Each structure stands twice: as C-alpha cells, then as structure tokens.
Design a protein around this ligand. Structure first.
Ligand SMILES: Nc1ccn([C@@H]2O[C@H](COP(=O)(O)O)[C@@H](O)[C@H]2O)c(=O)n1
Ligand SMILES: Nc1ccn([C@@H]2O[C@H](COP(=O)(O)O)[C@@H](O)[C@H]2O)c(=O)n1
Lengths: 203, 208
C-alpha cells in the first residue's frame, strides 16, 4: 500500500513546482499524477466551443479516468496518463506512461474536492498564495507557454478562474492537514514532506 | 550537538498551545516547552488600575530579554526557572516552573515569530491558523472559565486590544512560517508529521 499525498492549491499557487520538487527529490520512489492533464476529451467539439468551456469547474475534469488511474497505481499497476495540450485546447492522442511507486502524488487545483480522492489520501496538502501573486504567475505562464494574450487571460480569469477558485478550490483548504506557503521556494517544507513520504518506507 | 528548535505561533486561542503541548507529550522527556505568554514583564510594583490598562498583545508588554536568555540557556544545556504569569491577578506570580535542557526545544506564543532574535534560533517555524470568529469563541470560553473574566470584559479587551494587535503584529508573522497548521487542536496528521520530523532530527544527533 503506497503512501498517497494530495497537493491542492489555486492555479499558479506553487502546487505544481512543489509537487515536482518532491518528485525530483524522491526520484524513482514517486509516481506523480497531475490532475490538470485529466481534462475531459472534448476533441469532438468545435474550437470556439472549447474556448468557452469553464476549465475551473469540477465538471470539466475526467474524474473517472483520474480515479481509475490513482487506484491502478495503488494496486501496483502502470497507467497511460493523458497529456492535455493547452495551446490546442485538446487531449493529445499520445499518452505518457507512469510507473507504480511506493509514494503516489495526486496534484491539481481540485484534487481535494471529491470525497473519492480524499479517501485515498494519507496526507492532504494545500499550497496557499494570495490571488494577486497567483494571477501574476498565471499571466506569465499563460502568455509564455499556453499561447494566450493578456486580454484573454484577464477575461478568462475574471469570468471563470477567480469565481470557480472561490466557490470550489479555496473551500477545499478546510480538508488540508497542512498548508504550505511559498510553494515554489520553501526548502523546509519540501524537506519535511520528503521525509514524511519516506515514513511508510521506513514503516 | 545543537538542539532542534521549533517555533509555534498563532493568534490567541488558535490551537498553538494545544498543538505545542501535544507535540511535547508525544516526544516525552526529549522536549522542553517554553510558552512565551508566561513571560510578560513583571509590573507587580504598579497598582492594579495600571496593570489593567496594559495592552498584553503589543510586543512591548513582553519580557523578551528574559525569554531570549532562557531560550539561549536551554540551548547551552543549562536549566531554567520559568516564570508563571497569573492571568486572574494581572501580574507575574511567585510560582516558577523548572525546565530541564532537552534535545528539542519548542518556543510557543502569539508573538514568537515577531523578533528576529527569536526566529534566528529556530530550525522550523510553524504558524497555527484559525478564523477570528472561531478563535474568539475559544478565547471567550478560556477567559471566563480560567482567567476570571466576564463576557463584557472579554469583548472589550478583544475589540480594543487583542484584535487590532493581532492584525498589526501577529497575523503578519505568518509570512515567516515554513508550514501553516489548520485545526491545531484536532489535527493528528500535522501532529504526527511534526513529531516525526523531530524524531528524525533526534536520530541524527545520535548517529555519526
Ligand atoms: N483549455 C484549458 C484548460 C485548462 N486551463 C487552465 O488550466 C488551469 C490550471 O493549470 P495548472 O494550473 O497547470 O493546473 C486551470 O485554472 C484552467 O483555467 C486553460 O486555461 N485552458
Ligand atoms: N494580564 C493579561 C495578560 C495576557 N492576557 C492575554 O494572554 C493572551 C494569550 O494567552 P495564550 O493565548 O494563553 O498566550 C493574549 O492574547 C493577552 O490578551 C490577558 O488577557 N491578560
């Protein structure tokens, strides 16, 4: 039975960088499933419709597939993780393999929203950061990595990201066992989480 | 071999006391707990009227000199006699609690993360978080049941001193925390994690 760590937080809160830093530190001893790659396959829909979809509402996620994969990893089985293309607004036809590990990390904005996911977690983490600081990083990454314009990032943020964060993401912090500030640069928290992950290993 | 120093701060009735005590009990004899809120300045020479007017949530109300001295002494393997503050009489009481040196030291209080000299002694910084309404509820209960206060007195002190000082001095210190612990009075997972970290540090002291 692998040690499961749930790492939630708002978009650009540092949850991704924290989860990846934990993955790099623990190396081969960790299987990481970023829930942001599990958006539903809406490839059959016209581009214009895909551009309007609310990607911050729980309904936008393929929870069934995410849950299925988490369970497979928990049973020592490999999974074919989907790769979401943020520029094209679609799921890639090619999937990357994720091998089983003694430590499983489930990370994303809404990983603490469904009871089915929380029940699988031994440790629940919420990476906290003020909305203004997150918007800043969100704006930069969207423009530099996801082919978005400032105008588009603003429209989407105010009309979807922010409302959904307050309604769905933020409240899940109530389920967190530990809250981690400065997620993209917190050596002490990183080292501590890495040690706790090796707790079940040491038994 | 350098003791493991944990600072635990948070608003009043945040659960910082409960968490610190639970952590102390989990480590047993290998830990020394120093509650800073027993280190208010000794104003026993001033009359009650004056002592009642003091703002006990402002940094100036604390005997930081004594606190730092005691912390450093413990870090040097020397024992200390911790003063005990009498919250009913509004003054430092005659009682003292002897504290033996330990491989793990916990500095706990509403303002332990405020001064640089205290933060510099810490290996791990924890801030126990809780909503103001929930903290007030526990503050009200504790004050009436243990500190001889009335609901009217608690409300007045809270609105005029506790709250303003919390927002101006306590809350901002959360920025120095390495980890933030919610539900400090009922969080076995965070307790276990903190205890495990200390144990890991303890094992390192004996290994070579
Ligand atoms: N087509 C899509 C799908 C998701 N997203 C964004 O992905 C974000 C989270 O990315 P991480 O922050 O990479 O999970 C969500 O806040 C959502 O607004 C997007 O901007 N366009
Ligand atoms: N004479 C005093 C001294 C301190 N106090 C209170 O002690 C509180 C903290 O108690 P712990 O929360 O027990 O330290 C401070 O918030 C302060 O308002 C008091 O109510 N009367």
């Amino acid at each position: 039975k692998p040690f499961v760590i749930g790492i939630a937080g708002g978009t650009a809160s540092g949850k991704t960088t924290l989860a990846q830093a934990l993955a790099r530190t623990l190396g081969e001893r960790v299987a990481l499933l970023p829930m942001d790659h599990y958006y539903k396959d809406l490839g059959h829909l016209p581009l214009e419709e895909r551009l309007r979809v609310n990607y911050d509402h729980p309904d936008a996620f393929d929870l069934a597939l995410y849950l299925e994969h988490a369970q497979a990893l928990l049973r020592g089985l490999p999974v074919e993780m989907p790769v979401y293309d943020f520029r094209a607004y679609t799921r890639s036809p090619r999937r990357t393999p994720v091998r089983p590990a003694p430590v499983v990390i489930l990370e994303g904005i809404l990983v603490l929203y469904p009871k089915e996911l929380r029940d699988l977690m031994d440790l629940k983490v919420f990476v906290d950061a003020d909305a203004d600081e997150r918007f800043i990083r969100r704006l930069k990454r969207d423009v530099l990595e996801r082919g978005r314009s400032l105008e588009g990032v603003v429209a989407q943020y105010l009309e979807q990201v922010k409302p959904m964060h307050l309604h769905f993401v933020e409240p899940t912090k109530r389920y967190a066992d530990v809250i981690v500030p400065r997620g993209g640069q917190n050596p002490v928290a990183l080292e501590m989480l890495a040690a706790k992950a090796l707790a079940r290993l040491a038994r």
